[PDB]
């Protein structure tokens, strides 16, 4: 301020800071493959 | 350099730092104002320009730019260092190596930027409201910044005029004391007091024009000096004096005129101020002048040109004052040639290597 | 040279765990219980035996401040600096022993003591002497020796007694049925400084012998009590505020409570 | 700096009935009021004499201090000394608009230096070509009883004199008119620039 | 050593010790404030940079860092020793031996830490509220701490400006006495006293503009110096004087201007202050300057660079001033060459070994 | 520093019945006729002339010393000299929160230089804008009999003079009014910065 220091403003309002949390969840997929299908196919399903 | 990052944040990176406000006013009040501050800088800046240099690069220094010669450049360069503690040299490079333009940027309108690691990133030439923002975030670093030593400041010089800034204002105002005393002073050479029968009484304009005409004709002037001047009843002549006649702050001006010459480092004998004989016979005082305040100043600026201009070249170049065929050092040259020339025990080529000659 | 009263210097600082910390607090991490592993059966499910529940104890790292006003025979700057360092070395000693929670380190006496044999984690264990006024009349020092041997053999490798002066007085006042001074037998011995094979720390901020007071402590305070602190001492050589008095500002910040509740055992002078 | 008064003293606040006791007129006459028109004419002529020799006020009437440029950068010492509760520093403009300003100015009470020092290191600026009048009520008290009594006596020593001799006719006391005034005059030793 | 271990725990281990309070204010009032204190440091710091050295390592000293040359380094280094009694040199070592950076850390913002055994473990560079905590618990010890001699303190220097701190405040205030006397003074060249018929009486503004215009036109100025000035009844002219005219604290300033030059050790002849002739003819006073306050100062700092920088090398190196081809010591070189050159009894090779020559 | 009195004298504390005896008792016209409340108005004018020349208080009235900045670092000499028992050293801020203090200062009484003289070197600092304010009771005693009788005679030598002659009329006694006052004046020789 300019003239507010004389009347008030004995302290200038500091920035009230705030913490925003990133909870950091996990993204997980678990598809179920058969052992027969994993062995019979010419297509490499394990890498597909 | 490791502590460089800590001081930079306090000042504020990316923002111009100005330093001293009143720098431009010490120039008008201390260098265009009094002769002692005027002569002291002109005596030094015309001395450092006259000293030859030892290395190509000096072809740039010989002809820096149009209308600003070799000797005229260092007068502008050292004339900013003595005035405001800072020297600046812009290099304009149309060509990649050894840029063919040098320009002394005045240090009133130049401002530093602290940058990240404390060493500067920007210089700002600020005329009117217009800035330029020279950049130091590169390898050639287009401005050499010559600092005078300043212990308290981290970005500028000290400018000896600032150290003598009280003694300038004494010498400016004591000299203006006697000027305005010669312009505001009423001394009379007397007063014809006319009381009258009463304690107060005027004299009529008939009597008053009679009193002028006998004073105008018969009493004033050189040719009427000492007429016996009959005074009748009522009239009386009280002659006034002027009790301090000479010497209005005469020694405090003559003491402040020496302290100005003290700060820039000129001896009192060279500048022409009166005073007690400290140095003897000008073989000393001219040799003291080129050893305590010229050649240390010139070997410090030439050491900054030896490093800034070598950044445009590939190989680094040294650049020092000659300290030979500078005719103020002849008493240090007689004394060293006659010492070794009289040493007849060691042979001819053994003293050519001492005096600096190519041996034969 | 200006003199002063010589106060006690022993402060529990040299036997507790002194940790240089820089943040606002120091978090010690202690598990409360055991693994709970059992001998497995040959035909059983055998799963999830147990897991130690951990607990964070916070050293708040409080600050200590003393503010004297200064108001050429002796030089105040060195002398007041040699007095206020002593007062900061002595005033934290009271907080390390019987400090409470508010704005100061909580001493090991203020941690909700439970009689040993019914000892749980959240408290400190004590052993009773007998009659409420003093040591037991029939057999003195039995309270001392079973205080030693009611602690645990792993912490007794480097453990120490903590008393004040006039409790070590009442310890050295113990005598046999002929009056021959069980501790330091003659009148020519002195302080033997090795009670029960363990050192003695004369810390004056311990309470004295009273109706229920815990005047004798014993422990490996290197595991027990954690002093977390910052090593420096602030020195504001203040040339403002008052022209008449310099009013130096000196502050050290320090915190601490018990890290391990099993290390410290107390002697309650009651039944 | 003009310093005129907004309102004068009421006249009924002046102790004419006590000044009549001072001058030994008479006690129980049926007339008793032939001098009332003139006794307060000399009380107002003796207060205004001591208001100028002491630079005090004595009845706490309201003032108006119309000035243009500030005497010093921030201070602005007021002339009439015993003050309380400066009402309004209304800042007039070059012509017309009068905007009262809270402006962050304080008031430092004193009998010697009744300043108006500003807190923001600079008093409210002044529109070039415009004045800054300050309304303030300065004086000891509202009625006559709230005065310092020695200054009240110096009015009675002086207004009795004007009642007893009309023209300037010449006529040594321990505490006379002058010796009672002198602890209320302003003692200044500055003829300088600041 | 053993005493030091006891000394630490008195002041407090691990906590910063600051020392001098006013050393930030003596710089502005004693080095940027008066010319005598300004020139005295500049006379010495520009002298120690000019002295060559005798040893690789000097390749670091020739080019320590960007924008801070060899001569500019010692001006910054000695300029902190003369100002605050302490010199500091940060070394940045990307490489293990001979670290390629030197930085004069200013001694206002540096504080020591006593550590455990009394000899320092920490130095704290504190600008603003931000610290660095350099570490001394290693072998290379990245800061050389050059102390001036202090008998009472165990961690800092004495800083000759602190010893002259009374004579600075005399010279600063006596010089500011004459400044503000030339700026706050009302001398009149007279006073036209107008009493009147009464003891008091003003003159009307009709009469007053008549009185100005006959004073403005006919009496003031150089061109009206001495008009006979008729005074009618009531008017009277009392001419005032100005009784102390020159010499306001002229000798007490000049005695204090000598005690400042006394404390730093410069002779009065070199700096230019007036005074009685102590030294004769500048062959002595310049030789006295490079023998009582420059070369003892330079051989003390160079003895600390010879030991701190050898901690980065494997082999220890000596590093001393040249004490040869420094042209102020030529009168000690004439006197020693003409003594042995005239000693004809001892042979030719027997005197090349005395004068310092390579023998033949 | 305003230093207004909180309360004045009651008037019944003044020795009007005794001053009638100093006016005409044992010798005189008779008791005679004197406007009683007039005689109270000359005692209040003679005390207030001697309260100003001596800087004493004489009746032990209540004062209020409200000043902005401390002059020394710790000393604070009080002007009205014979003091006893600071009522309160309440400290108002620029808005008027009026937070009193109850320790940190110890009034050192003395007839020469009464002080506040805080403990050590720290005297209560002032809120910026918030004037400090000291209430104290200064004077000899509550009744007229507790005074030094030589100072009481200087009132009676002076209050009778204001009764005997009204205007400022001319009229060297060994112990006059002035000679009885001079051992109660304040002898100061400082014109300096402290």
User: What DSSP line would sit under C75-91, residue for residue?
Assistant: -HHHHHHHHHHHHHHHH
Residue bearing tokens 């600071």: F86
For residue F134, the cross-strand partners are: F65
Identify all chain E residues contacting D191, using CB atoms and an 8 Å cutoff.
Answer: 186
- Inter-chain residue contact C232 with E16, CB threshold 8 Å: yes
Residue of chain E with shortest Cα separation from D192: E184
By three-state DSSP, how is residue E17 classified?
strand
Identify all chain F residues contacting C243, using CB atoms and an 8 Å cutoff.
Answer: 72-73
Phi, psi of B249 (to 5 degrees): 55, 45
Are chains F and D touching, using the cut-off of 8 Å on CB pairs and a minimum of 3 such pairs? yes
By three-state DSSP, how is residue E261 classified?
helix
How many CB atoms within 10 Å of residue A30? 4
Query: Residue E216, Cα to own-chain centre: how many angstroms?
Result: 51
Best mutation target among F32, F167, F173 (most D Cβ atoms within 10 Å) is F167
**Among B residues 171-230, those touching chain E with beta carbons less than 8 Å apart:** 173-174, 177, 181-196, 198-203, 208, 211, 215, 219-220
Nearest to F74 among C67, C68, C245 (CB): C245
Nearest to C85 among E12, E17, E21 (CB): E12
**Whether D164 contacts chain F with CB within 8 A:** yes
- Inter-chain residue contact D161 with F171, CB threshold 8 Å: no
Element (H, E) at E44: helix E35-48
Residue bearing tokens 């320590």: E64
Phi, psi of A27 (to 5 degrees): -110, 110
Residue of chain A with shortest Cα separation from F129: A6
The pair of three-digit structure tokens given for residue E65, joined into one six-digit string: 């860092």
**Whether D111 contacts chain F with CB within 8 A:** yes
Is residue D137 within 8 Å of residue D62, measured between CB atoms? yes
Q: For residue C28, what are the contacts with CB-CB under 8 A and spacing of at least 6? A: C56, C57, C59, C226, C259
Element (H, E) at D181: helix D177-181
- Inter-chain residue contact F120 with C241, CB threshold 8 Å: no
**Whether F84 contacts chain D with CB within 8 A:** no
- HSE (CB half, 13 Å, CA atoms) of E354? 16
For residue F86, the cross-strand partners are: F136
How many CB atoms within 10 Å of residue B247? 12
Residues of F within an 8 Å Cβ radius of A: 94-95, 128-129
Is residue B60 within 8 Å of residue B112, measured between CB atoms? no
Residue of chain E with shortest Cα separation from B259: E35
Distance CA E128, CA B10 (A): 7
Nearest to E233 among B186, B199, B300 (CB): B199
**Whether D180 contacts chain F with CB within 8 A:** yes
- Inter-chain residue contact F171 with D172, CB threshold 8 Å: yes
Nearest to E237 among B174, B240, B292 (CB): B240
How many CB atoms within 10 Å of residue B86? 25
Q: Is C117 left (phi over 0), alpha (psi -120 to 50) or beta?
A: left
Find the distance separating the first CA and the last CA of chain B, reported in whole Å: 50
DSSP conformation letters of D141-193? -SSGGGS-HHHHHHHHHHHHHHHH--S------TT-HHHHHTTTS------S-
> Which partners does chain C have (≥3 C-beta pairs < 8 Å)?
E, F
In 3D space, the residue among F80, F98, F96 whose CA is nearest the CA of residue F136 turns out to be F80
Distance CA B262, CA E42 (A): 11
By three-state DSSP, how is residue F8 classified?
coil
Distance CA C109, CA C266 (A): 9
**Whether D158 contacts chain F with CB within 8 A:** yes
- Cα dihedral sign for E68, E71, E74, E78? negative
B137 burial via Cβ count (<10 Å: 0-12, 13-18, 19+)? exposed
Cα distances (Å, whole numbers) of residue B306 to B54, B61, B77, B148, C211: 10, 11, 15, 17, 87
Identify all chain F residues contacting C245, using CB atoms and an 8 Å cutoff.
Answer: 73-74, 120-122
Identify all chain F residues contacting D110, using CB atoms and an 8 Å cutoff.
Answer: 1-2
> Which partners does chain B have (≥3 C-beta pairs < 8 Å)?
E
Is residue E271 within 8 Å of residue E43, measured between CB atoms? yes
By three-state DSSP, how is residue E95 classified?
coil
Nearest to A5 among D105, D119, D124 (CB): D119
Identify all chain D residues contacting E186, using CB atoms and an 8 Å cutoff.
Answer: 191
Q: For residue F141, what are the contacts with CB-CB under 8 A and spacing of at least 6? A: F60, F147
Q: What is the DSSP letter of F101?
A: -
- Inter-chain residue contact E12 with C239, CB threshold 8 Å: no
The pair of three-digit structure tokens given for residue B314, joined into one six-digit string: 């590939």
Distance CA E106, CA B159 (A): 19
Are chains E and B touching, using the cut-off of 8 Å on CB pairs and a minimum of 3 such pairs? yes
* E183 to chain B, closest Cα gap in Å: 8
Identify all chain B residues contacting E47, using CB atoms and an 8 Å cutoff.
Answer: 296
Identify all chain D residues contacting A7, using CB atoms and an 8 Å cutoff.
Answer: 102, 104, 119
The pair of three-digit structure tokens given for residue D34, joined into one six-digit string: 């032939």
Identify all chain C residues contacting F120, using CB atoms and an 8 Å cutoff.
Answer: 68-71, 245, 247
- Inter-chain residue contact F120 with C246, CB threshold 8 Å: no
**Among C residues 207-246, those touching chain F with beta carbons less than 8 Å apart:** 241-246
- HSE (CB half, 13 Å, CA atoms) of F158? 30
* A6 to chain D, closest Cα gap in Å: 4
- Greatest CA span in chain D, whole angstroms? 64
Identify all chain C residues contacting E17, using CB atoms and an 8 Å cutoff.
Answer: 235
Nearest to D149 among F1, F48, F167 (CB): F48
Best mutation target among F33, F49, F56, F177 (most D Cβ atoms within 10 Å) is F49
Phi, psi of E74 (to 5 degrees): -70, -25
Identify all chain D residues contacting A3, using CB atoms and an 8 Å cutoff.
Answer: 103-104, 120, 124
> Which partners does chain A have (≥3 C-beta pairs < 8 Å)?
D, F
Nearest to B247 among E101, E132, E245 (CB): E245
- Resolution reached, in Å? 4.5
The pair of three-digit structure tokens given for residue F21, joined into one six-digit string: 């005896």
* E180 to chain D, closest Cα gap in Å: 12
Cα distances (Å, whole numbers) of residue D53 to D137, D138, E272: 20, 16, 58
Element (H, E) at B57: helix B57-62
Are chains F and C touching, using the cut-off of 8 Å on CB pairs and a minimum of 3 such pairs? yes
By three-state DSSP, how is residue D62 classified?
strand
Is residue C14 within 8 Å of residue C210, measured between CB atoms? no
Identify all chain D residues contacting F48, using CB atoms and an 8 Å cutoff.
Answer: 148-150, 153
Residues of D within an 8 Å Cβ radius of E: 191-193
Cα distances (Å, whole numbers) of residue E94 to E63, E121, E195: 16, 22, 89
- Inter-chain residue contact A7 with F94, CB threshold 8 Å: yes
- Inter-chain residue contact F125 with C246, CB threshold 8 Å: no
Secondary-structure percent of chain B, ordered helix, strand, coil, rounded to 5? 40, 10, 45
Is residue E82 within 8 Å of residue E44, measured between CB atoms? yes
Distance CA B353, CA B346 (A): 11
**Whether E90 contacts chain B with CB within 8 A:** yes
């Amino acid at each position: 301020g300019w003239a507010s220091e004389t009347a008030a403003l004995s302290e200038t309002a500091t920035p009230q800071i705030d913490r925003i949390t990133i909870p950091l969840h996990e993204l997980a997929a678990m598809p179920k493959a058969s052992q027969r299908l994993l062995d019979d196919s010419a297509f490499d399903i394990e890498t597909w | 350099s490791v502590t460089g990052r800590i001081v930079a944040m306090a000042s504020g990176a990316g923002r111009p730092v100005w330093g001293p406000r009143d720098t431009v006013s010490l120039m008008r009040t201390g260098f265009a104002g009094n002769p002692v501050g005027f002569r002291s800088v002109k005596l030094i800046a015309e001395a450092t320009a006259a000293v030859p240099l030892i290395c190509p690069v000096l072809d740039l220094l010989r002809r820096p730019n149009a209308g600003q010669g070799r000797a005229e450049l260092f007068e502008a360069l050292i004339g900013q260092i003595l005035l405001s503690g800072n020297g600046y040299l812009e290099a304009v490079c149309p060509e990649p190596g050894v840029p063919r333009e040098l320009h002394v940027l005045r240090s009133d309108r130049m401002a530093v930027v602290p940058g990240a690691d404390g060493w500067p990133v920007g210089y700002d030439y600020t005329v009117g409201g217009r800035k330029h923002r020279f950049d130091m975030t590169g390898h050639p670093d287009p401005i050499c910044h010559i600092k005078s030593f300043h212990p308290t400041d981290d970005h500028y010089g000290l400018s000896p005029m600032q150290a003598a800034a009280v003694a300038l204002d004494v010498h400016n105002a004591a000299s203006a004391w006697s000027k305005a005393l010669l312009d505001n002073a009423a001394r009379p050479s007397g007063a014809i007091i006319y009381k009258g029968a009463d304690g107060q009484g005027v004299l009529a304009p008939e009597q008053y024009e009679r009193l002028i005409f006998e004073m105008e004709t018969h009493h004033q002037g050189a040719r009427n000096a000492g007429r016996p001047m009959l005074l009748e009843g009522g009239l009386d002549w009280k002659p006034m004096g002027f009790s301090p006649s000479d010497m209005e702050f005469h020694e405090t001006k003559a003491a402040a005129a020496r302290e100005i010459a003290l700060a820039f480092g000129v001896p009192p004998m060279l500048i022409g101020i009166p005073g007690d004989a400290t140095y003897a016979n000008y073989a000393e005082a001219n040799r003291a002048f080129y050893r305590l305040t010229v050649l240390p100043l010139l070997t410090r600026v030439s050491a900054a040109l030896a490093w800034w201009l070598s950044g445009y070249l590939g190989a680094q170049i040294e650049l020092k004052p000659d300290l030979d065929q500078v005719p103020a050092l002849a008493v240090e040259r007689d004394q060293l040639w006659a010492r070794i020339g009289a040493a007849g025990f060691l042979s001819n080529s053994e003293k050519r290597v001492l005096l600096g000659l190519p041996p034969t | 040279t200006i003199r002063g009263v010589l106060r006690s210097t022993a402060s529990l600082r040299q036997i507790a765990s002194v940790v240089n910390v820089e943040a606002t607090s120091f978090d010690v991490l202690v598990d409360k219980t055991d693994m709970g592993s059992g001998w497995a059966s040959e035909t059983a499910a055998l799963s999830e035996t147990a897991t130690p529940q951990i607990d964070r104890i916070t050293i708040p790292l409080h600050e200590l401040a003393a503010m004297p006003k200064a108001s050429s025979a002796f030089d105040i700057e060195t002398w007041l600096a040699n007095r206020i360092a002593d007062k900061f070395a002595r005033a934290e000693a009271a907080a390390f022993i019987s400090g409470d929670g508010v704005d100061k380190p909580t001493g090991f006496l203020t941690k909700t003591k439970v009689a040993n044999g019914a000892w749980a984690w959240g408290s400190l264990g004590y052993v009773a002497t007998g009659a409420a006024g003093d040591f037991a009349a029939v057999n003195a020092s039995d309270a001392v020796v079973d205080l030693v041997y009611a602690l645990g053999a792993e912490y007794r490798a480097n453990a120490s007694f903590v008393m004040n002066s006039k409790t070590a007085g009442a310890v050295r006042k113990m005598k046999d049925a002929d009056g021959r001074f069980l501790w330091a037998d003659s009148l020519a011995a002195g302080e033997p400084a090795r009670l029960m094979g363990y050192p003695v720390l004369i810390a004056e901020d311990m309470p004295d012998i009273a109706a229920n007071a815990y005047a004798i402590a014993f422990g490996d305070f290197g595991n027990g009590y954690t002093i977390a602190e910052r090593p420096d001492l602030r020195v504001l050589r203040d040339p403002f505020s008052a022209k008449p008095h310099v009013l130096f500002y000196a502050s050290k910040r320090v915190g601490g409570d018990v890290s391990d509740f099993a290390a410290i055992k107390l002697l309650k002078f009651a039944a | 700096m003009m310093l005129n008064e907004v309102t004068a003293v009421p006249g009924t606040a002046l102790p004419v009935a006590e000044f009549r006791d001072h001058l030994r007129l008479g006690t129980g006459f049926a007339d008793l009021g032939a001098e009332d028109a003139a006794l307060l004419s000399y009380l107002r002529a003796a207060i205004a004499a001591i208001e100028g020799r002491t630079a005090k006020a004595l009845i706490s009437r309201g003032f108006r201090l119309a000035l243009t440029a500030w005497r010093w950068g921030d201070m602005q010492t007021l002339p009439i000394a015993p003050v309380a509760t400066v009402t309004a520093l209304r800042l007039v403009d070059a012509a017309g608009v009068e905007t009262p300003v809270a402006a962050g100015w304080r008031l430092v009470p004193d009998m010697a230096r009744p300043r108006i020092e500003a807190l923001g290191a600079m008093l409210p600026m002044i529109p070039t070509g415009g004045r800054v009048e300050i309304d303030f009520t300065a004086g000891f008290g509202a009625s006559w009883s709230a005065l310092p009594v020695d200054l009240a006596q110096a009015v009675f020593l002086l207004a009795a004199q004007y009642y007893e001799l009309r023209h300037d006719g010449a006529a040594a006391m321990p505490f006379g008119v002058m010796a009672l005034i002198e602890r209320w005059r302003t003692v200044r030793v500055l003829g300088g620039r600041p």
